[PDB]
Design a protein around this ligand. Structure first.
Ligand SMILES: Cc1cc2nc3c(=O)[nH]c(=O)nc-3n(C[C@H](O)[C@H](O)[C@H](O)COP(=O)(O)OP(=O)(O)OC[C@H]3O[C@@H](n4cnc5c(N)ncnc54)[C@H](O)[C@@H]3O)c2cc1C
Ligand SMILES: COc1cccc2c(N)ccnc12
Length: 436
């Protein structure tokens, strides 16, 4: 099935690989691009899996969702009509994009520009993109809890996880979310709405003092926690899981502070591990500080190999070495890698943006280096802007309920100016003052 040689080989069938395939086709008319994806599904966007897909009857089957504005769209980047078969890819006139699903690259030979698949098939390439993303992390407490507890714990990542958890939300009475990040908070709000109509229970616990405590300042993290609680969620901050067992058929969670939580199903949203397995056979460098494949500003690792997406630890000429795990970063970095695979030699320059929605009432947008450990200055009026500072310069911005102004935030971080009064900068976001 898989051809023996392909000009462009994209490893992984996710957001970064699809953006690169589109970029290659637009930069090199007639290009022949092969995507090798271990998932049986075609490339699809994941943000809807924890948001729009939950705010709707046949969605689990159609996988179509209504944006907050109303326009309906599919979760897949393109219908199967957009793609060509891997068998006909070398022969179709003016080429195309093919996806080899259900196949995993298990070995990478950088010297001979060759990969070996899980079925023994070997494919030679001229240009290669590694876009393997990552796999959800699991807490050690669940790992030493036995098959019973582990069979009742969901690692939310793929379309299959959305379907399995959606079915469980209609069968069990209590679901517990372990994780205070954006994923855990969005799932809490989503399951919260589901539970308000079915009269069930949703619990979210995490070690921080409030939701997204590692991202937003304390005063805003606490505000967000109250918003999640008002969505029908029992939020337990300052909770460190000590052990997990079964008691009376239900899962029993023991916290390091003595508290106990009884539930029927657990959803662990506790971060991501970059998929760097191919670094061994390929002799590729892994970044010790951020994880992932270490690449340069052009996202290049070796002469004919690039890395994009969650798995790429790259050099930001403006902000320093980073590894970003955002949907728009996978699109931007994937688009950039695609251009550099066709001879662009362009560095990461256009800063990708981040967003999060906790329902159609609360909305976040972020750009740059956003970390609660950095010094912050917030200007609010409901809504506001939070500046993240380093060396008296704005390196990150979080827009709270402020939309259609990301270009202004991007320009601020690019100019790298030392602003005397951040209140005047807040006026740029139509805001007319806290610190941490
Ligand atoms: C539920 C959910 C909600 C999200 N919501 C948001 C949001 O609201 N805003 C936001 O900014 N970001 C969000 N994100 C993050 C965003 O989806 C990720 O940053 C993005 O999907 C990363 O794209 P990627 O191509 O780097 O990796 P992935 O999307 O993980 O794609 C990698 C693909 O490659 C496959 N693969 C891995 N190794 C191999 C191999 N050796 N051979 C073949 N195939 C392989 C993997 O199975 C996977 O199919 C969300 C993520 C999830 C899971
Ligand atoms: C770090 O980026 C992410 C990774 C995984 C999930 C999400 C999510 N649900 C919302 C926003 N960002 C996410």
């Amino acid at each position: 099935k898989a051809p023996s040689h392909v000009p462009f080989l994209l490893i992984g069938g996710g957001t970064a690989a699809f953006a690169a395939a589109r970029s290659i086709r637009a930069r090199d008319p007639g290009a022949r691009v092969l995507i090798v994806s271990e998932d049986p599904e075609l490339p699809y966007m994941r943000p809807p899996l924890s948001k729009e897909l939950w705010f709707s009857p046949n969605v689990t089957k159609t996988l179509r969702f209504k944006q907050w504005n109303g326009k309906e769209r599919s979760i897949y980047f393109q219908p199967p009509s957009f793609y060509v078969s891997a068998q006909d890819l070398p022969h179709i006139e003016n080429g195309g994009v093919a996806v080899l699903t259900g196949k995993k690259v298990v070995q990478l030979d950088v010297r001979d520009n060759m990969v070996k698949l899980n079925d023994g098939s070997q494919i030679t390439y001229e240009k290669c993109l590694i876009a393997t993303g990552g796999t959800p992390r699991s807490l050690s407490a669940i790992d030493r809890a036995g098959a019973e507890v582990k069979s009742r714990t969901t690692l939310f990542r793929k379309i299959g996880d959305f379907r399995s958890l959606e079915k469980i939300s209609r069968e069990v009475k209590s679901i517990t979310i372990i994780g205070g990040g954006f994923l855990g908070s969005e799932l809490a709000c989503a399951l919260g709405r589901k539970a308000r109509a079915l009269g069930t229970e949703v619990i979210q616990l995490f070690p921080e003092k409030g939701n997204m405590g590692k991202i937003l300042p304390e005063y805003l993290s606490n505000w967000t926690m109250e918003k999640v609680r008002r969505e029908g969620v029992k939020v337990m901050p300052n909770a460190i899981v000590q052990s997990v067992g079964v008691s009376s058929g239900k899962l029993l969670i023991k916290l390091k502070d003595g508290r106990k939580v009884e539930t029927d199903h657990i959803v662990a949203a506790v971060g991501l591990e970059p998929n760097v397995e191919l670094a061994k056979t390929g002799g590729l460098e892994i970044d010790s500080d951020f994880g992932g494949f270490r690449v340069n500003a052009e996202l290049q690792a070796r002469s004919n190999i690039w890395v994009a997406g969650d798995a790429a630890c790259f050099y930001d000429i403006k902000l320093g070495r980073r590894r970003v795990e955002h949907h728009d970063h996978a699109v931007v970095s994937g688009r950039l890698a695609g251009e550099n695979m066709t001879g662009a030699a362009k560095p990461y320059w256009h800063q990708s943006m981040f967003w999060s929605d906790l329902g159609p009432d609360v909305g976040y947008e972020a750009i740059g280096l956003v970390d609660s450990s950095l010094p912050t200055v917030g200007v609010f009026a409901g809504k506001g802007v939070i500046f993240y500072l380093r060396d008296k310069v704005v390196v990150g911005i979080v827009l709270w309920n402020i939309f259609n102004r990301m270009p202004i935030a991007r320009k601020i971080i690019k100019d790298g100016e030392q602003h005397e009064d951040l209140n005047e900068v807040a006026k740029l976001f139509n805001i007319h003052v806290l610190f941490q």
